[PDB]
Design a protein around this ligand. Structure first.
Ligand SMILES: Cc1c(NC(=O)c2cccc(C#N)c2)ccc2c1c(C1CCN(C(=O)C3CCCC3)CC1)cn2C
Length: 230
């Protein structure tokens, strides 16, 4: 593929991300000073695991929507079979939500944006899954260290979604081609921005997949005991 085709793909993913980023980076950064008081923290910690489950499920479904919209705006995604689209989204939408979380994470105080303010992992005490929440905080902490640009997130999360290795892909060669184009797009933009160094610093492919697997397992248990309608 020619260099203008690669650049166009970079511009496209970058534009698709801008339109589906949920909140602008500037807004998240600004609101870092808007932190929960000790009383608000105590408020959340006193809630039952069921009220906390409802609040986290509401936040995660709002997050998944923007990711679904992001995927729909990706070059060649709509062209795939409904089965192949679903295979890609069921496997990768939650992995993208985990990557996008680094933008609303503040490494200075180890806080996250949740329900209009910033709070530490102590906010999620009532859920009773401190190991899982501590692992999600660790993953966001390691990505925050990379100081990802908005276009770097766009390209990386596009590559999380467009994966030819997903079990159950019918049109596997189409997906292999789209993944190949996006990989040239990602390498090209990193060279143009003098950021090829981040490639080494990225999480091992298995890390994201394993953390998402753990997260979803926990959400499935909560769904079985206390279902929530979309
Ligand atoms: C909320 C959040 C953000 N905020 C955002 O991503 C955010 C919020 C509002 C606009 C935008 C935007 N744009 C981003 C960023 C980093 C985060 C989190 C969290 C939560 C996630 C939800 N929770 C769960 O699923 C538990 C896990 C077990 C079952 C329920 C508890 C832990 C952890 N870290 C590291």
């Amino acid at each position: 593929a020619s260099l203008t085709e690669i650049e166009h793909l970079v511009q496209s993913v970058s534009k698709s991300y801008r339109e589906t980023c949920q909140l602008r980076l500037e807004d998240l950064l600004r609101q870092r000073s808007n932190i929960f008081s000790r009383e608000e923290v105590t408020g959340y910690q006193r809630k039952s695991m069921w009220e906390m489950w409802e609040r986290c499920a509401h936040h995660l479904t709002e997050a998944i929507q923007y990711v679904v919209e992001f995927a729909k705006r990706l070059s060649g995604f709509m062209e795939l079979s409904q089965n192949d689209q679903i295979v890609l989204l069921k496997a990768g939408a939650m992995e993208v939500v985990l990557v996008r979380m680094c933008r609303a994470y503040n490494a200075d105080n180890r806080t996250v944006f949740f329900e209009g303010k910033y709070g530490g992992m102590e906010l999620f005490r009532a859920l009773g899954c401190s190991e899982l929440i501590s692992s999600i905080f660790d993953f966001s902490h390691s990505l925050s260290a990379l100081h990802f640009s908005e276009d770097e997130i766009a390209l990386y999360t596009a590559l999380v979604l467009i994966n030819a290795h997903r079990p159950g892909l019918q049109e596997k060669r189409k997906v292999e081609q789209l993944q190949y184009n996006l990989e040239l797009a990602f390498h090209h933009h990193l060279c143009k921005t003098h950021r090829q160094s981040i490639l080494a610093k990225l999480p091992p492919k298995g890390k994201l997949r394993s953390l998402c697997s753990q997260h979803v397992e926990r959400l499935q248990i909560f769904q079985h005991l206390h279902p929530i309608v979309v």
